[PDB]
Amino acid sequence: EKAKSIDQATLQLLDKAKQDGVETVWDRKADMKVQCGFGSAGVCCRNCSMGPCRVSPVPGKGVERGICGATADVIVSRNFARMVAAGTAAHSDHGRSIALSLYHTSKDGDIKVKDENKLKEVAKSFNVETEGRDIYDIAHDVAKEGLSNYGKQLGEVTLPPSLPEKRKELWRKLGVYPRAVDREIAAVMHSTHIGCNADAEAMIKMSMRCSLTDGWMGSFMGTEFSDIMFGTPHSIDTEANLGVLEKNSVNVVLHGHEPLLSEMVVEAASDPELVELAKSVGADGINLCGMCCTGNEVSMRHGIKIAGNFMQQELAVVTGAVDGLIVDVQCIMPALAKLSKSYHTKFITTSPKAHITDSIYMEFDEENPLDSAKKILKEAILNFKNRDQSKVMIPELKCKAILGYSVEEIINKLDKVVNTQIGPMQTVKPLADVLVSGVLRGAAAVVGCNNPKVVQDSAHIETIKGLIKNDVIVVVTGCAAQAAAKYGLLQKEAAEKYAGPGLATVCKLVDIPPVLHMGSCVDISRILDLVGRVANLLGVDMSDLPVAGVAPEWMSEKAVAIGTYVVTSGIDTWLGVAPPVTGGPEVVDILTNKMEDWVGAKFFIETDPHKAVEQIVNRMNEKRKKLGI
Amino acid sequence: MNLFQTVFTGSKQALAAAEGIVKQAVDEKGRDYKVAFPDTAYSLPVIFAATGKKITNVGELEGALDIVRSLIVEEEMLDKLLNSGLATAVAAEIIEAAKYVLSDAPYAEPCVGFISDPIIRSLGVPLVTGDIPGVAVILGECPDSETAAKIIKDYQSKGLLTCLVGKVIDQAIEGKVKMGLDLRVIPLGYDVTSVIHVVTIAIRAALIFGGIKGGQLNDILKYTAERVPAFVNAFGPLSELVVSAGAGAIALGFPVLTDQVVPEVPTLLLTQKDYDKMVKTSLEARNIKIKITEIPIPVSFAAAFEGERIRKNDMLAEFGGNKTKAWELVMCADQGEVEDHKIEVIGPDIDTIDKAPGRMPLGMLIKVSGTNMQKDFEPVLERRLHYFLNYIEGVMHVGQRNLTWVRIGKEAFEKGFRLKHFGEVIYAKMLDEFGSVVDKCEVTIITDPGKAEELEGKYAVPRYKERDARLESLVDEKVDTFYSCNLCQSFAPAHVCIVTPERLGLCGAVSWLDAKATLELNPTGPCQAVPKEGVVDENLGIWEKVNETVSKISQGAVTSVTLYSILQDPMTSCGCFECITGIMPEANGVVMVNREFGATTPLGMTFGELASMTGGGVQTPGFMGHGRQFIASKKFMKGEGGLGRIVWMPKELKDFVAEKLNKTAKELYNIDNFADMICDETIATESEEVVKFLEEKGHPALKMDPIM
Ligand code: SF4
Ligand code: SF4
Ligand SMILES: [F-]
Ligand SMILES: [F-]
Ligand SMILES: [F-]
Ligand SMILES: [F-]
Ligand code: NA
Ligand code: NA
Ligand code: NA
Ligand code: NI
Ligand code: NI
């Protein structure tokens, strides 16, 4: 009865999937039928073998406490904590690999330093000397100091400069100032053990402390170091959606997250031997396509075409045109191994962090990265000989998209509206001014996943379209950004098409689209860098600005960690999918009310995007009045 | 207070005032008295542009308040703010109209009051031609009568039209400035509402010139924003009403510069507290460029002054040549690494030397900061220094990098020339020429011997080495596009240079990569791309599309060019070649003489005499003008026989190319002693003597094919 998507190409292939007789993520959601209301409310605990225990989400009725004595609030808050601990760890290991790659950069090696100016500037944040030193001794000293942020047991951690000092001392008084990344993950996992913490407030506060090691450390260093090694993103053109697949080219799709592999596949797709090889098997060339975050990472830096977002990964295989599906870690549906048994596609896993049964394991040798990517790519190009062009169905649907909007590039773009003799250059002042003046009502980040509980991409598009109509500039990352890209919002033409008067004027003056694709989900750290720069420039804290974050169709534990650190940093967050918290009323009051008194923001749970847009606008105008703007 | 509410409040105040004076109107004169401005076919122009309806009697003036009420929705969205700003403007026309219905002559000089239609026509046509670059609506009060006159005379000097309204009229008459239409300084009225009489200038300008109809308000606002160049300057404390009026200027498209702290809006409402530089921010905020850049140096500056010839008997100081070490450098720098308009002379100036003409070292350091500036544009900015300096009367500049040569004359020093003026020219021209890619300029002229040495090998040489290294890799066959420059058509109209990776521009200062970059900065510039298509012969370098574009740019004076041959259809030569190649039939080769060498060559001519036999944009077989780096080129005379034809150079040319030339000799299977086989002026300078020298050394050219 309900529509499965709002994207036509997504729907066309869904029909082919039914004809071919293959399962999709929608079909498995249906097979699940009415999902257990206990786990949907968070009032089930399995933290020890006395259980499984389930208490009633309706207070006063049914079973009240678990066998150990845990209340509903205790069970909910611990389950919520372990979600943050998981998402934190996901981004943690991500940035740890990126820092390790930076430690192994050499002058003549496969991994180099590409943005010397950024490294010199990042080195100043770690108190690493740069005057007259070799650029790789600097990079190694930066990597070492960044790695210390993951497991140091003595001393304090290094935090970015755009984090307002008001917020640091706020965290200190609240007792949520971050420690080492792995050290907090262990701390949350410790207190959630049976017979440890049994207080909702203290439990949530540990979760907020954990999430800070993600946004301002794990994800932040991951992004900063990814820019140093691969290049800081700048505005770039690309095409999005499943129509980027070419029938007469070798289609290699990069799925996953960790960017070192996809960065090396891009460089491997230009080796004359591998270029000549694709021609020898009968194709026109090598057509690199990205999906999800590793697709975002290479599109921001190299404009590689974005094949699609989370709930489309199954449908790319259904086209019958994917010769290689090269995946690393995070958000690779294990169903792909069974699905690709019905097609010539070679589904190749590469990271020992994410083995998948019945896939083809080709370990990405991080000690010979380029040679290793070539070996994996050659296997994909050879697989082109096994394509059956009669069963191929590539929908004729693709949209142009502009992305590459890093903080540096937004600042660079804003310099255009600065009078040579008046203001300062290379600052975020132009954006602060249009916010203070009121031409822009606010700025909203729209991030998040896809989720079968929501018509895929429908909540993203309605939220984004509604915010830009009310003169709220919108920045996007991850699968939401790729949902904007497919729809056609990442175009300068989208301003007069969909934006209100103020946003349309700023868009024309700055020469930008109304929706800024700021990269992958570790790249959300760019959003914090941006908002923090505006707060510092206006002498205020981040809870005082008219900013907001939205997760219209989230799913991953990464999103819970992301949403939790966005709030603790001081930014109101709207969720479009109810988290499993309804069972514990104290947990609800903490996340949706008391949070305000702690950090200056709170969570909002709204499944109607049009309602959420109202709330965001009203909350912004409320905060605007408090600030006098 | 929030900025939207600050405008709304004033807008309501504007409306409230209009209701009060139109009430005076209906009591003294009834609802049927004629309402009209003098000498205007458009009745009330702001109300006419908005609604296309004319207002004749007082009852209609009272009924036109409903317009101001309809434009005043109090919602914090951008469109409502502009409309509210329009409301204040319409209420200003209402108030102003009532002034003219209560008194037959309500304005008396010095205040002009309402502007008649004939003045619009007299003043409109120079606004279209840009003879008056913009209009400056300056209202309010300056902190000092001197600071107000300083500004209005500045605008007056730029030729643009300035209109005063408010206390500044009394400050401007105190500051000795003179008003009048022919003086381009018009005072409207002392009241804030008399800004509407410059607003009716722009609106009536649309209805007359744009030919648009009344009621096409959004088409008016497009014409006012794009065509008529207005900008308002608000000085002194800003009331809510005047801020509302400022929103009206935003609605027409006019940025609002002020000295009052205010919530800025980019390109629209700005604070500049430095009055000395206020005019500059205003002109930029309205994208207004004056026809002639201002020069602080007293000596005359023009393009006609370039090419002037200064003899030894008329020169004051000489820098460069083989006599002194003189270099010029332009390098990109960080924003915080340079201070804007920072001029520094390190060493003896021209006032210190009171003796006969002497030679000083000259190091010209030029640090430039830019948001989008990059390392590939440094040679482009260096090139303009030759064109910047030679424009100055009494100074002469030739050469490129560290092989430059500068001569200053006795007239300029007798006119008070100083080394401080050098940076003043470079600072202003670099901004004027490259106003989009350049933010700040810092110029440091060095005549100190230590700092000239402590800035040549440290910043000048490494920038050149990295520069010359990026061309060494390239070969003409690898590229697919050549570039055509016509800058020197100012004195050689038929001359066009085709720059290739292996054939640099004969001035030496323009490379293939340099010519590619000049096209990126200036699409309507001198350097233009030419695709390598329709090749007829690769050995001599004849291209069909090259012949197509040379014929066009030379206006049909040249029909065919060969790039790597000097006997068949040679490329022309202008007049800035560092060296000259001349055909000697006795040696079955060619001779090369450089500019600095002043003695005779075995061709019976000196460099100045050879220069008369090659330049002028004339197709000259056997003679070519070329840069110094083109000597060691693989494609240098490839059809004739390459570098193997050279038999005579001065000793200075040998020692400078010994490393570069020996390698090209071994690349053509010539023994490393090839630089030594060439004759020089310490051996013999006559063909009778040189021939036997070439027979003794066993020169490879002697046993080549005859050249012709
Ligand atoms: S922690 Fe307590 S409520 Fe939870 S499963 Fe264990 S015994 Fe049951
Ligand atoms: S020598 Fe040639 S490239 Fe140089 S300015 Fe003159 S015409 Fe142009
Ligand atoms: F297939
Ligand atoms: F691992
Ligand atoms: F008056
Ligand atoms: F010249
Ligand atoms: Na940084
Ligand atoms: Na398969
Ligand atoms: Na409260
Ligand atoms: Ni020339
Ligand atoms: Ni010349």
State the CATH class of domain B303-462.
alpha beta
Question: Of the candidates A568, A477, A487, which has an alpha carbon nearest to the alpha carbon of residue A527?
Answer: A477
Instruction: Spell out the residues 6+ positions from residue B88 whose beta carbon is closer than 8 angstroms to its own.
Output: B7, B10, B11, B14, B68, B241, B244, B245, B247, B248
- Return left, alpha or beta for B621; rule: phi > 0 is left, psi -120 to 50 is alpha, else beta: beta
Amino acid letter for position A48 = C
- Give yes or no for B265 touching A (CB within 8 A): yes
Length of chain B: 708
Beta bridge partners of B396: B407
Judging by DSSP bridges, how do beta strands B589-594 and B623-626 pair with one another?
A: unpaired
Sign of CA dihedral A503, A504, A507, A513: positive
Amino acid letter for position A307 = A
Greatest Cα pair distance in chain B: 117
**B102 with B20: CB under 8 angstroms?**
no
Residue that the structure tokens 């309501």 belong to: B12
Helix H or strand E segment including B306: none
For A105-259, where are the E strands, in sequence order? 236-240, 250-255
Length of chain A: 629
What fold, for B117-286?
Rossmann fold (3.40.50)
Instruction: Compute, in angstroms, the gap from residue B507 CA to the centroid of ligand 6.
Output: 8
The CA radius of gyration of chain A, in Å to the nearest whole number, is 24
Last residue before each gap in chain A (C to N over 2.5 A): none
What residues does CATH 3.40.1470.10 cover in chain B?
579-697
Nearest to B3 among A412, A415, A437 (CB): A437
Contacts of A423 in chain B (CB under 8 A): 264, 270
Q: Which of residues 454-493 of A touch B (CB under 8 A)?
A: 471
- What's the token pair of residue B297? 């140096």
Q: Say whether A531 sits in a helix, a strand or coil.
A: helix
Beta bridge partners of B581: B592, B624
- What's the token pair of residue A392? 């191929």
To 10 degrees, the CA torsion angle through B530, B533, B536, B539? 70
- Residue A103 burial class via C-beta count within 10 angstroms: exposed 0-12, middle 13-18, buried 19 and up: middle
How far apart CA A626 and CA A8 sit, in angstroms, is 44
- Residue A87 burial class via C-beta count within 10 angstroms: exposed 0-12, middle 13-18, buried 19 and up: buried
Output b/e per residue, A264-274; b: 16+ Cβ within 10 A: bbbebbebeeb
- Architecture of B471-554 per CATH? 3-Layer(aba) Sandwich (3.40)
How far apart CA A74 and CA A53 sit, in angstroms, is 12
Sheet holding A515-517, edge to edge: A515-517, A472-476, A442-446, A547-551, A572-575, A603-605
Nearest to B284 among A420, A441, A471 (CB): A420
How far apart CA A309 and CA A485 sit, in angstroms, is 10
Ligand 1 pocket, residue A50 CB under 6 Å: yes
Atom of ligand 1 nearest to the CA of A55: 3
- Residues, CB within 5 angstroms of ligand 3 (ion): A 320, 343-344, 388, 391
Experimental technique used to determine this entry: X-ray
Q: Do B77 and A417 touch (CB under 8 A)?
A: no
- Distance separating the N- and C-terminal Cα atoms of chain B: 88
How far apart CA A319 and CA A315 sit, in angstroms, is 7
**A513 with A495: CB under 8 angstroms?**
yes
How far apart CA A197 and CA A180 sit, in angstroms, is 21
Instruction: Compute, in angstroms, the gap from residue A353 CA to the centroid of ligand 4.
Output: 5
Instruction: Compute, in angstroms, the gap from residue A289 CA to the centroid of ligand 8.
Output: 19
How far is residue A279 CA from its own chain's centroid?
36
**A81 with A202: CB under 8 angstroms?**
no
The hierarchical CATH code for the domain B579-697 is 3.40.1470.10
Q: Do A426 and B372 touch (CB under 8 A)?
A: no
- Return left, alpha or beta for B545; rule: phi > 0 is left, psi -120 to 50 is alpha, else beta: alpha
Judging by DSSP bridges, how do beta strands A472-476 and A286-291 pair with one another?
A: unpaired
**A607 with A578: CB under 8 angstroms?**
yes
State the CATH class of domain B3-102.
mainly alpha
Sign of CA dihedral A43, A46, A52, A53: negative
Q: Do A437 and B270 touch (CB under 8 A)?
A: no
How far apart CA B277 and CA B292 sit, in angstroms, is 18
For A373, A573, B329, the CA distances from B482, given in Å and listed in that order, are 38, 56, 26
Instruction: Spell out the residues 6+ positions from residue B692 whose beta carbon is closer than 8 angstroms to its own.
Output: none
Contacts of A418 in chain B (CB under 8 A): 266
How far apart CA A596 and CA A574 sit, in angstroms, is 14
Atom of ligand 1 nearest to the CA of A66: 3
Contacts of A430 in chain B (CB under 8 A): 266
To 10 degrees, the CA torsion angle through A88, A90, A96, A102? -120
Amino acid letter for position B617 = G
Instruction: Spell out the residues 6+ positions from residue A525 whose beta carbon is closer than 8 angstroms to its own.
Output: A215, A216, A219, A220, A222, A223, A224
**A332 with A313: CB under 8 angstroms?**
yes
**What does the DSSP 8-state code read for residue A340?**
G
How far apart CA A375 and CA A277 sit, in angstroms, is 13
Q: Do A421 and B284 touch (CB under 8 A)?
A: yes
How far apart CA B10 and CA B91 sit, in angstroms, is 11
DSSP string, B343-369: EEEES--TTT--SSSEE--EEEEEEEE
Q: Do B4 and A418 touch (CB under 8 A)?
A: no
**What does the DSSP 8-state code read for residue B304?**
G
Residue that the structure tokens 């919520």 belong to: A80
Output b/e per residue, A163-198; b: 16+ Cβ within 10 A: bbebbeebbeeeebbbbbbbbbbbbbbebbebeebb
Q: Which of residues 75-104 of B touch A (CB under 8 A)?
A: 76-79, 81
**B433 with B356: CB under 8 angstroms?**
no
Residue ranges of domains in chain A: 58-233, 234-404, 407-629
How far apart CA A146 and CA A225 sit, in angstroms, is 9
Ligand 2 pocket, residue B425 CB under 6 Å: no
Helices A219-230, A72-103: axis angle to 10 degrees equals 20
**What does the DSSP 8-state code read for residue B417?**
-
Question: Of the candidates A227, A286, A259, which has an alpha carbon nearest to the alpha carbon of residue A366?
Answer: A259
Output b/e per residue, A287-326; b: 16+ Cβ within 10 A: bbbbbbbbbbbbbbbbbbbbbbbbbbbbbbbbbbbbbbbb
